[PDB]
Symmetry: C3
Subunit: 36 residues, 3 copies
């Protein structure tokens, strides 16, 4: 299913970008603890 694969890849991209931002948010909190 070609069109379904295109959409799956786009969802792939969205989920990774959301995880990158969630990792940055946790890094901010961890750094506050590390330098507190």
């Amino acid at each position: 299913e070609w069109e379904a694969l295109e959409k799956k890849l786009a969802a792939x991209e969205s989920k990774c970008q959301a995880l990158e931002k969630k990792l940055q948010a946790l890094e901010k909190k961890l750094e506050a603890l590390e330098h507190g």
Copy 2:
């Protein structure tokens, strides 16, 4: 290689889902420190 691309995309999905759960597990530990 069409069939190889389908499988690569499925592995893609599995790895992201595993990373999302690993991020949740680290968030739990960080929150315990933040509110300790």
Copy 3:
């Protein structure tokens, strides 16, 4: 665009692998705090 989808999937893979390593790096720092 078949060739563009192949490349997008490869970028997908690279970004997940980079995020896995970033999560490991944050886990190392969190563990230092947790056992400090």
